[PDB]
Design a binder for this molecule. Structure first.
Ligand SMILES: CC(C)=CCC/C(C)=C/CC/C(C)=C/CS
Ligand SMILES: CC(C)=CCC/C(C)=C/CC/C(C)=C/CS
Lengths: 496, 492
C-alpha cells in the first residue's frame, strides 16, 4: 500500500476515476428513535440483511423490503420506514471529495459513479444533491440488476464504459469492493478516516442481428411504413391502414443504423410545398390540412442529412411562428378552423426552431413554457392529445434537452428524475426502449429495461406491434411492429 | 401387424399430432385476402413463441396478421375451423387403451399452445390413459430441441433402456434416439421400428429459512393487514390455523419441527378454535375448518385413530343448515358456510370411512356447483384467492379416486386455464402442486416461482385467509415459503 494523507495527485496518474457514493461522497447515521419502543434501533441492521440485496438489485421496492424486514427484524413496519426516513435526513455530503471531484471534472473528466443503491433512494439522492453533473456515467445497482460485491457488476462497467483496466483507479471505503476491482487489474484507493491507502454476451449479438434482419426485410418490402389501426395500445385485432406518412417519418428520425438503401427509399416516398400532411396523398380527405408535427419531424431530418438548408426551411418556420393560439402557443395544424395543441408536437416544432437558429425568437416563449409546465406539473402522466404514453413525451423532450445543451438546462434534472422513477414501470417493449435511450443520452445506464427488452423479442426477430399514437376523436390507435422493432434495436445499439 | 413389440417395453411415450389426432389446414371464409392454409401459420417462427407459452393466441394472430398479410379475424376463423376438423386416430387410441390396461407407464409429449391444449383436454377423453402430460406451452420448451427430451427423462425418471417413443417426425425421433430411447415411426402405410443445480441451491436456501423460522416460532407467526400482500402488516400471532395448514401441507418438514408444532396444537375436546386460548373472545366457538384439518393430520400421522374421531365427525354431520349443507362453526348462533371448509370436512369424512354417509350429499353437491358454475372465481367466504379452492378441491379429488371422478376433468380444466394467471408465489405454488397431483407438469409457474424467492431464502408474505366482517387479511412468509418448497419438491 501507500498511506496517503496530503494533497495528492496520484490521481492524475490515471485515465479513469470510479467513485463509490458511501463515505466517499455521502455520509449518514443509522441509529434512530421513534415513539415506538419495540424492535431494532439501528438501520444498519436492515442495510446488512440479505433482503436488502434484493432491494439494491431492483428486485423489490422499499414497501416490499420493509414488510419482509418487519418479520425478520421483529420491528413494526412503520418504525422501520420512519428510521429509514430519519437515516436519509442525516445525509451529509463529503465536501472535500466533492471539491476534488469538481476538479477531476474540470480536467480530463472520465469519472464514473458505481454504487449499490436502491432505485427509490437513488431517485431522492439524484434530485437532492448536485454532484452528478461531474459524472460521465452513473452505474447504479438498482438500474443494473447487479450488486457491487459480485464480479459480474465489475465486468459490466469495464465493458460498457470501455475503459483500459490499467489506466483505472477506483475509490471506495469498503475493502471487499477494492479487492474485486483489483482482480480485474484496477488500482484501488481505501478512504479511511485520515488515511487514503493506495495500491498500484453473444446472445445479445444473435438477437441484434436477428432483429436487424427482420426490420430490413419489412422496410424493403414496404418502404412506406405500414400501420395497423385498432382501439387498444396492443392493437389486438388491428386492421391494416398503411395510409399515413408519419410512421415512416418517425422511423427515419429515430433508428440510426438503417441501411443506405432503405434511407434513400423511404426518403423518396416522403419527398413525393415544404409542408406535409398526415395522410398519404392518395388517402387524404379533401381540404384536410397539413400539420406541424409531420412537417417539423421531416424538415428536421432533411436538414440533418443536408438534403435541405436553413434558408429553404425559414419560410415554413415563420408560418409556424404565425400559427399561435390566443395564449401564444403554437398549434397543431395549418388550419385556423382546427385549433389544437399538443405537448409533443410543441417539442418537435421547438426542436426545428433551435436547429435553424430561431431558438431565441420571442414568439416561442409561450410554447416552451407550456412544455416545461406540462413536465413539472406531471400532466405528461396523463399523456398528450395524440400520445397516450408518458415515456413518449419524456423521450421527445429528452432529444430537445440533450441536443441543445445550453438552451434547456432547466429541464435537465427534472426530466432525468422523472425518467429514473419510471425505470421498469411498464412492459411494452417500445416504452422500455424509449426509457433506455433517454436515460443513456442523459448519462444513466438502464440495464434493467434492456434485459426485459431482450426477453420480448418474437422468434422472427421483430418485437410486438405497439400503438404509438392515437386519433382522439375515436381513440383509434396506430402502430406497427416496425416502430417497435426500430426503437428496440436503437436501445440495444445505445447500450452495447 | 400385431404389436407384441410394445409389450416388450415398460414405458411408452406418445406424441399427439398425426399419432393420436388429425386435422386439416386449408380453409375459407367470407374474406378472400390472405392465406388459405393454417399450416402457413404453424410453420412461422412466431408460432414457436405461441407453442412455448411465451405469447398467447391473440398476440400470435396479431403478429401473423401482419407477417402473413392476412386479416386477423380471418386467421382466427381459420384456426377455429382447423380445430373443428380434429379427428382421433381410432387405432392409436385403442392401442393406448390396451397399453394403459396392461399397466404400462404412458407419457404424452407434444408441441401445443395453452389455449389449444385446454380445448383438446376438454374435447377428447383419452387423457385418462396418460400417467403424465408434457405440453410445450406448460413447459416453456419446444419439441425438436434436446432440452425438452432431457427434461422429460429427468422429470419422469425414465429408464431409456425400457422406454419407447412413438412419433410422426424424423427430427423428433432422431433426438429421442440420441438419449437411448427406442423410436417407432408412423405413416398411413409404413410403421418403422428402430431398436440445473441452481434449483438445488434455492431449495436448500429456502428449507433453511423455513426451518430457522419455525424453530424460533413453532406456533406459525401471523400478520394482519387489509390487502393480500400484507403491506404494512402488524404482527398478530394469536391464531393456530396457520400452524395447522403448514403441518398439513408441507411434506419435508423436519421431525423436530413436526414434534414442536404438534405439541403446540394439542395444548382434550378433540375440537379446535381459530384462536390461541390466551386470545379467545369469551364464548367464541370451535370451527370445523381448524378441527377438520388438525384431525385429518393427526390421523394421517397415527397420533389418533378413526375410533377417536367418529364422535366429532358425527357432531359435524349434525351441523347442517336447512339447505342441508354442513356449516363453519360449532355454534347455532353463527350459521355460516364456506366451500373450502366443506371440502375439508368432506376430506376428513372420507379419511375415516364415512365417505358415503347419505347426510354428506347436500354438502358434496354444494362443492361441485361452486366449481362447475365458476363461482369459485369470486372467492369463498374466508378464502379470497380462486386458486386456494382449486388446491383444496384437488386434494379431495385425487386422494379418493373413484369417489370424486365427476370433479376430475372440470377441475383439471380450470387449473390448465389458470396457468401463469397471477404473480403471487403462493398462488403459483398451489397451481403447480394441484396440476402435478392431476398428472400435468406446470414448469411455467415453477420457473416464475424461483424468480421471486428473496435473498434470505424465504418467499414474500401472503394473505391466505380473511375475516369477512372487517375484511382483514392474515398470512406469513412461513405460509408462502412452505407451499413454494412443496411445489419445488413435487416438480423435482
Ligand atoms: C401523432 C401525430 C400528432 C402525428 C402528426 C399528424 C397528426 C396531428 C395527426 C392527427 C392525429 C391522427 C392520428 C389523426 C388520425 S385522423
Ligand atoms: C381458520 C379459517 C380460515 C377458517 C375459515 C373458517 C373460519 C372459522 C374463519 C374464522 C377465521 C377468521 C378470519 C376469524 C376472524 S374473527
Amino acid at each position: 500500500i501507500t498511506s496517503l494523507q496530503e494533497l495528492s495527485q496520484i490521481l492524475d496518474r490515471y485515465d479513469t476515476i470510479v467513485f463509490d457514493l458511501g463515505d466517499v461522497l455521502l455520509h449518514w447515521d443509522s441509529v434512530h428513535f421513534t415513539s415506538e419502543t419495540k424492535g431494532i434501533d439501528d438501520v444498519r441492521k436492515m442495510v446488512k440483511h440479505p433482503v436488502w440485496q434484493d432491494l439494491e438489485k431492483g428486485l423489490i421496492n422499499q414497501e416490499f423490503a420493509l414488510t419482509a424486514l418487519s418479520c425478520e427484524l421483529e420491528t413494526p413496519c412503520s418504525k422501520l420506514k420512519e428510521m429509514l426516513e430519519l437515516s436519509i435526513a442525516s445525509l451529509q455530503v463529503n465536501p472535500l471529495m466533492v471539491e476534488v471531484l469538481r476538479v477531476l471534472h474540470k480536467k480530463d473528466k472520465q469519472i464514473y459513479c458505481l454504487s449499490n443503491v436502491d432505485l427509490e433512494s437513488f431517485s431522492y439522492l439524484y434530485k437532492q444533491f448536485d454532484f452528478w453533473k461531474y459524472f460521465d456515467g452513473i452505474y447504479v445497482s438498482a438500474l443494473l440488476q447487479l450488486r457491487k460485491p459480485n464480479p459480474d457488476i465489475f465486468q459490466y462497467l469495464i465493458s460498457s464504459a470501455s475503459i483500459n483496466t490499467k489506466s483505472t483507479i477506483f475509490i471506495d471505503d469498503k475493502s471487499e469492493n477494492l479487492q474485486e476491482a483489483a482482480n480485474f487489474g484496477i488500482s484501488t484507493l481505501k478512504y479511511n478516516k485520515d488515511n487514503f491507502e493506495y495500491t498500484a454476451t453473444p446472445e445479445i449479438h444473435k438477437k441484434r442481428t436477428l432483429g436487424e434482419d427482420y426490420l430490413n426485410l419489412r422496410l424493403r418490402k414496404f418502404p412506406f411504413c405500414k400501420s395497423f389501426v385498432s382501439n387498444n395500445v396492443e392493437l389486438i385485432g388491428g386492421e391494416d391502414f398503411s395510409k399515413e406518412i408519419f410512421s415512416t417519418a418517425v422511423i427515419l428520425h429515430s433508428y440510426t443504423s438503417l441501411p443506405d438503401d432503405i434511407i434513400a427509399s423511404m426518403c423518396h416516398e416522403i419527398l413525393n410545398k415544404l409542408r406535409w400532411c398526415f395522410y398519404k396523398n392518395e388517402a387524404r380527405p379533401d381540404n384536410f390540412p397539413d400539420d406541424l408535427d409531420t412537417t417539423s419531424m421531416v424538415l428536421s431530418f432533411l436538414l440533418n442529412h443536408n438534403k435541405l438548408t436553413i434558408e429553404k426551411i425559414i419560410p415554413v418556420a415563420e408560418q409556424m411562428i404565425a400559427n399561435r393560439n390566443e395564449e401564444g402557443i403554437i398549434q397543431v395544424y395549418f388550419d385556423d378552423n382546427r385549433p389544437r395543441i399538443d405537448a409533443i408536437v410543441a417539442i418537435n416544432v421547438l426542436y426545428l426552431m433551435h436547429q435553424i437558429g430561431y431558438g431565441e425568437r420571442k414568439e416561442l416563449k409561450e410554447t416552451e413554457a407550456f412544455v416545461f409546465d406540462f413536465l413539472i406539473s406531471k400532466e405528461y402522466l396523463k399523456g398528450t392529445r395524440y400520445y397516450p404514453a408518458p415515456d413518449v413525451f419524456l423521450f421527445f423532450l429528452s432529444r430537445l434537452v440533450v441536443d441543445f445543451p445550453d438552451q434547456f438546462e432547466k429541464f435537465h434534472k427534472p426530466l432525468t428524475e422523472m425518467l429514473i422513477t419510471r425505470v421498469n414501470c411498464s412492459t411494452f417493449p417500445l416504452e422500455r426502449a424509449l426509457r433506455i435511450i433517454a436515460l443513456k443520452k442523459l448519462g444513466i445506464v438502464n440495464r434493467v429495461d434492456f434485459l426485459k427488452l431482450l426477453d420480448t423479442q418474437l422468434a422472427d426477430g421483430g418485437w410486438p406491434v405497439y400503438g404509438l399514437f392515437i386519433a382522439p376523436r375515436s381513440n383509434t390507435y396506430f402502430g406497427s411492429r416496425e416502430l417497435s422493432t426500430a426503437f428496440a434495436l436503437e436501445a440495444l445499439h445505445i447500450l452495447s
